[PDB]
């Protein structure tokens, strides 16, 4: 087939990345608020959560999508947006170990929820590719990350739409891209005051021209398994699920305080601690930064430190 034959020239794509459980709802609320604001403008819209990311786990990267067009959407039944025009990061640490910019189209915008400088973020990204704008908004200082058991698996959310950080972040998206009218976005969120803070206080930088950025079919890829899908048992590690990129924080040890009681070691659900003659050794390849080891450490040898504090 041809991309020209099934082209939808007036279709906009939005991809939101978030942390599972703790921020998945706001991810949902961002794409829901924008589609409800666009529908008010007489446009054809579609919002949904990444089905393969379901069920979301704590701190696992999860996605929510939006498709907004002035013409009828002839591509409704998909799993993901193949070519995002807007990429949104609900949590800042998602600039590490996660393909957030894969597929982005020219003139695109990246919006990040963070208190850290734009320059700091751009040092973690590296290749900005087809991006035209990098945007930061301190959404955590404007609202709270909402957590509910409602609105899951397609059911309606009983906590409404956009009461938390979804509102300032969505407000920041609009000021950068103008994807919908801000006054329409105001009418669909439960926290319009925070939204207007995000709209007003977001910082937008236009990136230097990238004329050598390339122009695939991501969702057409299959993955074949062995006989009957049976796999050999791992010996030391399961590389089929590397969970290091779940971290928003990591445990740092003060070994002069550590008594080597190995209380942390027996309680780690992910087996990331190994006993040594030098004391406990933490596996950063798989560590999810859950913080249990820090919480059970009785000597205070362990402390949680934000992931972006490390040049790793």
């Amino acid at each position: 087939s041809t991309k020209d034959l099934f082209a939808e020239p007036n279709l906009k794509q939005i991809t939101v990345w978030a942390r599972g459980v703790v921020m998945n709802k706001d991810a949902r609320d961002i794409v829901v608020a924008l589609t409800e604001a666009a529908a008010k403008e007489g446009k054809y819209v579609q919002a949904w959560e990444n089905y393969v990311d379901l069920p979301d786990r704590i701190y696992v990267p999860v996605r929510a999508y939006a498709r907004i067009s002035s013409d009828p959407i002839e591509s409704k039944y998909i799993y993901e947006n193949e070519t995002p025009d807007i990429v949104v990061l609900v949590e800042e640490s998602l600039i590490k170990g996660v393909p957030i910019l894969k597929g982005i189209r020219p003139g695109s915008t990246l919006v990040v929820n963070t208190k850290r400088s734009i320059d700091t973020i751009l040092e973690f990204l590296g290749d900005t590719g087809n991006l035209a704008q990098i945007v930061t908004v301190d959404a955590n200082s404007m609202a709270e990350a909402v957590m509910t058991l409602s609105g899951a698996e397609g059911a309606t959310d009983a906590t409404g739409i956009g009461a938390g950080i979804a509102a300032p972040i969505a407000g920041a998206v609009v000021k950068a891209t103008g994807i919908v009218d801000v006054e329409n976005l105001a009418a669909v969120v439960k926290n319009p005051a925070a939204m207007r803070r995000g709209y007003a206080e977001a910082q937008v930088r236009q990136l230097p021209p990238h004329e050598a950025v390339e122009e695939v079919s991501a969702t057409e890829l299959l993955r074949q398994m062995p006989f009957a899908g049976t796999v050999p048992s791992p010996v030391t590690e399961n590389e089929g699920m590397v969970t290091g990129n779940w971290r928003i924080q990591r445990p740092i040890i003060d070994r002069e305080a550590c008594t080597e009681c190995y209380t942390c070691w027996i309680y780690c659900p992910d087996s990331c601690i190994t006993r040594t003659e030098e004391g406990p050794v933490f596996n950063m390849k798989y560590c999810k930064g859950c913080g249990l080891c820090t919480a059970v450490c009785p000597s205070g040898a362990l402390t949680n430190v934000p992931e972006l504090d490390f040049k790793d």
Binding site: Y51, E74, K76, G154, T219
Partner: protein, 393 residues
Amino acid sequence: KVRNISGCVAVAHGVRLADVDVICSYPIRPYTGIMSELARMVADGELDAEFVHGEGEHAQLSVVYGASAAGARVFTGSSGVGVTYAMEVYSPISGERLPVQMAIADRTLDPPGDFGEEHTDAECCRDQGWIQGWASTPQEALDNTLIYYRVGEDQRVLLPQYACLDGYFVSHILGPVDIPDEAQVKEFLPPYKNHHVLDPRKPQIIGPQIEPAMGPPLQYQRYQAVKGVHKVLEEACDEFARIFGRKYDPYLDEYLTDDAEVIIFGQGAHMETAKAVARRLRNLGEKVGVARLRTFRPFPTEQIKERLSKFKAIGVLDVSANFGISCSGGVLLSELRAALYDYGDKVKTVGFVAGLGGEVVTHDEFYRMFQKLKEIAKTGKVEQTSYWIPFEL
């Protein structure tokens, strides 16, 4: 009132509008959202019903079996291995003529665990004697819920129904839905009154052991009920258009078939994708069309025979793994070829198996399907009866 809701929520409103008296829940992806919404509706007093927490799918149908025999309008649902776990209860429900409605948000059967959708799960129940059909949109998931209660609970029918909808693609993905008013449904859906019921004031023995001699009369009796469904379904689809303003064809949702040479025949949400591809091809001059099957059981043999015997070649999409079946496609290919058998030398038929494990049936794949069909239309020869996409096409 038009809202952007999932197929799950769409079904829930249909149930709510039906004023169902008994519901039995149990969780399984991707139908779970249906019960969650229903659970909230009962909690908020949006619906007065007994919300029974079933210990499993087998119990779900069983609870729903007894409640229906007690004269209550009932609802339940499941997905994948849940549908097959309850398999034992389906025929008892049908044979006792209890118009139970079971919503099915499709999902691939084990093994291994896969949340993606296939029509395989609901198609295992095709012999069970239920009314069966697939909704391709969230709007139709609601509409079919109302229609099937009307047709199913009809005293000329009194048969259980499978309200099917594609997993995720319909059940999860949000879509524009016109939610009917409580006044419209009251004019469309009459109260459930069966020919038998458990009542100490008119005591009846429901389902006594029979000898083999009594076998043929009973099986033929239910058969006469199954054959009479189509007529009742025509009345309900006409009545739905009048009251609600949406005109559904009781058998085939046809698109650009008037002067089409080749078409794609199938069911479910992936058919809506096929229409889009067909329109794009029409913009290139290609005389291609699409026929979406709205009624899987009772299968519309004669209706299909009259309406689809005007095309050179017909491609049948089967979003399922019906292993070992004749012509090695899926069920729809086998049942379409049976229907057009008299025209087997003129109308070429070929099977397309795709969307396995819940994968997307893409525009590209539909394009390659239409192109394969054109080659068949030119040559009049079918090299092999089925193509398993993308491996073989």
